[PDB]
Paper text:
The ribosome is a major target for clinically used antibiotics, but multidrug resistant pathogenic bacteria are making our current arsenal of antimicrobials obsolete. The improved resolution enables a precise description of antibiotic–ribosome interactions, encompassing solvent networks that mediate multiple additional interactions between the drugs and their target.
In addition to direct hydrogen bond interactions, we also observed indirect interactions mediated via magnesium ions for tetracycline and a putative potassium ion for hygromycin B. For tetracycline, the primary magnesium ion (Mg1) is fully coordinated by six oxygen atoms, three from the nucleotides within h33 of the 16S rRNA, two from rings B and C of tetracycline and one from a well-defined water molecule. This differs significantly from the less defined Mg2 coordination observed in previous studies. However, the ratio between backbone and nucleobase interactions varies, ranging from 31% (four from 13) for avilamycin to 83% (10 from 12) for spectinomycin. For omadacycline and pentacycline, the conformation allows direct coordination of Mg2 by the phosphate-oxygen(s) of G966, whereas for tetracycline and eravacycline, the Mg2–G966 coordination occurs indirectly via water molecules.
Numbering used by the authors:
A (entry chain E): 13 to 39, 48 to 70
B (entry chain G): 2 to 145, 148, 151
C (entry chain I): 4 to 128
D (entry chain C): 2 to 207
E (entry chain B): 90 to 117, 138 to 161, 168 to 181
F (entry chain J): 5 to 31, 34 to 102
G (entry chain S): 2 to 85
H (entry chain N): 2 to 101
Write the structure that this text describes.
Amino acid sequence: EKLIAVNRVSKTVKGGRIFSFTALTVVFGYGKAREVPAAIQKAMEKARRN
Amino acid sequence: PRRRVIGQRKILPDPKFGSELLAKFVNILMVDGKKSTAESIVYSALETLAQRSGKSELEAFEVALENVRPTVEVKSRRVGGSTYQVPVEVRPVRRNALAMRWIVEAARKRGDKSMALRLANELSDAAENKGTAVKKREDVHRMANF
Amino acid sequence: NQYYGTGRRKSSAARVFIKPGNGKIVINQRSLEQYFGRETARMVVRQPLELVDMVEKLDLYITVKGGGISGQAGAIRHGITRALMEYDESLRSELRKAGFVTRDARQVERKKVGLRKARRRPQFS
Amino acid sequence: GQKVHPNGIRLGIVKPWNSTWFANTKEFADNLDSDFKVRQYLTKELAKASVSRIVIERPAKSIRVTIHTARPGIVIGKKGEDVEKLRKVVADIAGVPAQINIAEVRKPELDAKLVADSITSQLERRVMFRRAMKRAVQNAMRLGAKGIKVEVSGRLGGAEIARTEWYREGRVPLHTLRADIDYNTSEAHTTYGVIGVKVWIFKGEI
Amino acid sequence: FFVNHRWLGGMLTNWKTVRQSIKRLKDLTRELEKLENSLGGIKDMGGLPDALHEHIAIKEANNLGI
Amino acid sequence: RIRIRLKAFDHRLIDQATAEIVETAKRAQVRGPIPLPTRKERFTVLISPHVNKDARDQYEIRTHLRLVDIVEPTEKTVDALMRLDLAAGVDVQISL
Amino acid sequence: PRSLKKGPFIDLHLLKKVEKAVESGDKKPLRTWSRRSTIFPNMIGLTIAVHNGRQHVPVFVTDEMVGHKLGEFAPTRTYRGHAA
Amino acid sequence: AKQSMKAREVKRVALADKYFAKRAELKAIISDVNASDEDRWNAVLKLQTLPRDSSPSRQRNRCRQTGRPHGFLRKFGLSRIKVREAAMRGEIPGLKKASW
Amino acid sequence: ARIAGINIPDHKHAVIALTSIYGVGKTRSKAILAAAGIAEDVKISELSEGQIDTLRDEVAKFVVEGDLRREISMSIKRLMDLGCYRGLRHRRGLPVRGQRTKTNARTRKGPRKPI
RNA sequence: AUUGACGGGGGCCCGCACAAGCGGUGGAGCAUGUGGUUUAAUUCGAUGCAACGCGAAGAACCUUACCUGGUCUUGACAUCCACGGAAGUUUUCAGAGAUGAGAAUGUGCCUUCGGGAACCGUGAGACAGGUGCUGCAUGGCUGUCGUCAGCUCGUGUUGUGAAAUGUUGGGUUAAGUCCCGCAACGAGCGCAACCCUUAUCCUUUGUUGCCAGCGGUCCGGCCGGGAACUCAAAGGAGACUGCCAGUGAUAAACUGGAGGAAGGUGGGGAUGACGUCAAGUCAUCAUGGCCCUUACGACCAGGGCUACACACGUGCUACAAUGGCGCAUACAAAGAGAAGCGACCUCGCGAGAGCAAGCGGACCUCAUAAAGUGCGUCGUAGUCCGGAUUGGAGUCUGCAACUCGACUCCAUGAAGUCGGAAUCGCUAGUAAUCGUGGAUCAGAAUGCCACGGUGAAUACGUUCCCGGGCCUUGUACACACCGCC
Ligand SMILES: CN(C)[C@@H]1C(O)=C(C(N)=O)C(=O)[C@@]2(O)C(O)=C3C(=O)c4c(O)cccc4[C@@](C)(O)[C@H]3C[C@@H]12
Ligand SMILES: [K+]
Ligand SMILES: [K+]
Ligand SMILES: [K+]
Ligand SMILES: [K+]
Ligand SMILES: [K+]
Ligand SMILES: [K+]
Ligand SMILES: [K+]
Ligand SMILES: [K+]
Ligand SMILES: [K+]
Ligand SMILES: [K+]
Ligand SMILES: [K+]
Ligand SMILES: [K+]
Ligand SMILES: [Mg+2]
Ligand SMILES: [Mg+2]
Ligand SMILES: [Mg+2]
Ligand SMILES: [Mg+2]
Ligand SMILES: [Mg+2]
Ligand SMILES: [Mg+2]
Ligand SMILES: [Mg+2]
Ligand SMILES: [Mg+2]
Ligand SMILES: [Mg+2]
Ligand SMILES: [Mg+2]
Ligand SMILES: [Mg+2]
Ligand SMILES: [Mg+2]
Ligand SMILES: [Mg+2]
Ligand SMILES: [Mg+2]
Ligand SMILES: [Mg+2]
Ligand SMILES: [Mg+2]
Ligand SMILES: [Mg+2]
Ligand SMILES: [Mg+2]
Ligand SMILES: [Mg+2]
Ligand SMILES: [Mg+2]
Ligand SMILES: [Mg+2]
Ligand SMILES: [Mg+2]
Ligand SMILES: [Mg+2]
Ligand SMILES: [Mg+2]
Ligand SMILES: [Mg+2]
Ligand SMILES: [Mg+2]
Ligand SMILES: [Mg+2]
Ligand SMILES: [Mg+2]
Ligand SMILES: [Mg+2]
Ligand SMILES: [Mg+2]
Ligand SMILES: [Mg+2]
């Protein structure tokens, strides 16, 4: 299994900025989550089906 | 208010005569919850307004109210930035309310010694179109210009 | 027999005993006129008997404690209304319509932290 | 916003008091101070013995202390050796005849104080804060908590800027008064200062 | 087996979640009718079925190969 | 005649304690338990360490109070009532 | 003021100094911190240097001062006007 | 509170207890309607000479946990802050949040 | 009419009229009239010249008017000459009885003096 | 192009936000906090809303952190070590006291007569000590938007992607409240409910509370009694849009009606989502780092925190006749009390004093409710309004009321005749007004927290002002319009 990059993305809210993480994995899969570990899992899950 | 669901509270009739009109009048005269004080003023004033009229206390009260009750008054409305003074019809409850308020306000700044006498004199003057209460009604009518 | 009713208003509670008679009213071992100075108080007490037309058909023995002059007058009215309904249950509809059967549950609202009173807030600059 | 103490708001609804004695004003303050010194002593002495809660009762001219413990064997000791030491010190502190009773905490992973103490112990051993928090949550939900929240606040990982992090699983309905919310706290004294831990464990209504 | 009212977007692509409403209907009057007017003809299906306006249902069927 | 006043911070606790007494003594005619007025002692505290004067907590201790009177009491009664054991957190007070 | 039933207050240390000063003859100033002590008749003619927080202010005792406290004659605050 | 400030209070409580009977004896003479003016005067001068810290009015109630000299509650012997902390942990018997 | 070298009001009740005298308040006024044997609610106009003589004798038992002003002047002068704290407060025209001066003190200081 | 935020863009809504009202503040005197100035010191902190009767629920000494001066150096507060002392207790002198120096009396307890420790020195030196600094290193606790109705996640699906959907829409609600539709299906935290209190009833128990009917009286529930009633406090019952009609989408719900003590969240409280402001607090406490150590630590007396050309905030008392004064006389609730509450009686004009019951309280005490009502008087005056200020004389607490207490008596009798621009609170047992209690506390409230009494006016409405919610739209904003330029 092959993670390629991890990007930190941001959306702005009333309070400030919600930072979140993206994970690109071929085994392709593009995951999104609040944490890096969760993002990679979602990516790897998607890369199996796709 | 915005939700505008305001009903009205059960006014008890005045104990002596049995008028809700006069009960409201006592409430408008009353200060600091001292209803017993206000009742004695109103009834003292009415007794004098009877012996200086030759009629029932409430008949003479009615005559005074007749001459003070407004029919029309102005209301401010924001249209264009510069705020107009717009005449509208006064509904009959507000007519009685303003008249009583004006009579009480008139009587309070009169120069007689007791409030009972000040009030009797205001109602006497009102019942023949003279004092400051009827001047307020006339002033309101002058302003009432859309 | 005696017909009984408890009445309450603000912090007053009244005990009202009614028997066939001719318009005696005793409140705390005193006449109505002696006990209550105010006409409003006396009117309030007599309102139920005036409504049902039994002012000089009934003797009232009353005791009352707590609250003030208006509280106690209101408590007595409620008590008389209940005693009447024990005497004659047909009177309920008329007494209900007059608003005498309701226990007025308005009480003093508590003082609250940061307020001068129950609702009066300190002045803001 | 600030939140009401979950234990405090449920006292008498679904949570018992940890001190159950009667006193008039005369003895009230003195009893609170003796209770304070008893709990201070026992918390010091039984730091390694997984103490969740110390219930104090004062029947007559006496003190009865119940220690809720996940490791009862070492509190009690060797045919009641360690417990007899504690009793004699508790009687000295309290100034009345003492009785120490021992209640076992089965399922220490569902005990908010022990979970909080477990996390703060790990943080003082320089364990990564996220891993301590996640394991606590996972353990509680495995043994049948209807929910758990864990919060850690301070200089996490020795960061200069302090921050709060929290994780929840399941239900933690704090506004529901009949909810059995077990709540407790702990402090990790690290080389970069204090890290506070808060644990909420929900175990069902009533 | 049949879906004869509204096809719920994710009926089969999100089968795992719609199964929890199957379990919910099975255990259990208005929450009933709302489920028996929807998931009442997939309650014994047990998994991804054999074969089947319904652009959504066809699209889900193509994703899985049903 | 033995007046027994019970006090407790918990009404469930005191009602159990009185039930233990009256049971023991009714095996002597007792009177009660009489529920005397609960004392509500109240405390208002500032909850901030500094300033914020309008932020307070209000706390209460309720002291529940019962009276039981034991009449024509026997040697068994004075004994049975002392070999009795009430729960902790219930203050008991006898008067002869 | 102090109840008449209790008599006038004087610090014992000051009383003993004054009594010794009076019997010895005309003294240097008596140094005291007892601002709260009442001035008695036997103090008339003595200088009592009374503390004001930072220095002992000389107070030559007269008959009119009798019954006052010593601190009345040694002001503790310094004020000479704003905007000087 | 500083350790010294807590130590000052311990000294005050000790001295007050040591001299309680003596102080009451002297104040009884000074309050006595029928005492000699010599006896009252001697008693006034004697009461001065005892340590000032033997007067109970010199004691400031302090929180028994922190030594805080403000916000004290006599019932609990604690400051407002420590009362709250103990109250919420269920350590003050009977005490709960009040509403009415 | 004339008591203590001042004109007392003739229309007023005796108890109120005597309080025109400096040194006579309500308590002393009532005591004067009790001693003189005159009712409080009698007007000064209604009293006989013998009754005004009795009031003059009763008023002569107190320090009033010019004698009292002299006593009060001398008491303040004593303090100011003593150089006591109260004396210094009198000289400076500030409150003498421990009142705050950061604010208020307007009775002693008078109207505000703009900076 | 996306998510926000913002718009003197649009649509729809809400809140004493405005309007309608009632009473205030702003003027006066005083109380109190703050700024400033002053000072030896006027200890430190809180600063737009969200600091300014705030931390402080109570600074004469103490408290006390500050100043002046006098003093101590392993030490006021711990542990360890060694040696010599039982510890205590009575007292004298010098000293402002800290403290220094003497006198005198104790000599126990455990005790394998090996002893040790309860407790005192004194001598080391590891240490103690710090209300010293950093709240922008932190924990904990708190304010705030706001009790506003929001804030999210999993999985699915959509988009290259930031992200979106769900959460929007049609209705409806106090409410993302509920219904219906819908590429979403579900879920979590919030809403609501569960908790406390108040309004009605029932059961149980019946003294210290109760007195309807008896019997008796000293006419006082006072006494025998009674267990009815008030009440006490445990347990129950009761309200659900449940019933009826109309309306509505065959919905949710809405409008009205019945019954009912109560009606649509019945009234009030507790309860404060994700987050925001490097918001507040290193002086409650705790704590990283830094810093001081014969001093930034410690002890003492006296002073200061109470200063006063002045400015601001929060209050109290007024300016009177709906009132003042005098006499007479009704009706509360809630609470506190043993180094405490203190009756009766006697003394005092009074604050109080003396004597001395009762009460750890439904029993005794605080403890007079006041406004009210009746009668009388004053007669519109700077007054019989107001009660500041000052003189004199006292009382009490307290080692001690000079700086700097509260209260009393006699005397004094200021400003003030309803307050400019502006501005605040309140929608009902509310506002307004009237007393009552409590915490802190030796003493020291006009503050704070709580309790009853009397008891209003007004709301057409949502155009406008302030804060906020939802949808949509433009943006060169993202330190987010207090922006960018
Ligand atoms: C004085 N005033 C109350 C200021 C203010 O208005 C603030 C605000 N958010 O409105 C602050 O943050 C303000 O209150 C505040 O907290 C400030 C700070 O915390 C700091 C700190 O800690 C260190 C350096 C600088 C600052 C600061 C400039 O941001 C401070 C400004 C403060
Ligand atoms: K005069
Ligand atoms: K001053
Ligand atoms: K903080
Ligand atoms: K999603
Ligand atoms: K620090
Ligand atoms: K004030
Ligand atoms: K003001
Ligand atoms: K006057
Ligand atoms: K003083
Ligand atoms: K004003
Ligand atoms: K006090
Ligand atoms: K917009
Ligand atoms: Mg009130
Ligand atoms: Mg305030
Ligand atoms: Mg004096
Ligand atoms: Mg410390
Ligand atoms: Mg003190
Ligand atoms: Mg003062
Ligand atoms: Mg308005
Ligand atoms: Mg003003
Ligand atoms: Mg600081
Ligand atoms: Mg300051
Ligand atoms: Mg700061
Ligand atoms: Mg700011
Ligand atoms: Mg001081
Ligand atoms: Mg000496
Ligand atoms: Mg901060
Ligand atoms: Mg949203
Ligand atoms: Mg919801
Ligand atoms: Mg939807
Ligand atoms: Mg209805
Ligand atoms: Mg809720
Ligand atoms: Mg800051
Ligand atoms: Mg000092
Ligand atoms: Mg100050
Ligand atoms: Mg007057
Ligand atoms: Mg008290
Ligand atoms: Mg009590
Ligand atoms: Mg006077
Ligand atoms: Mg003038
Ligand atoms: Mg409202
Ligand atoms: Mg008041
Ligand atoms: Mg909404």
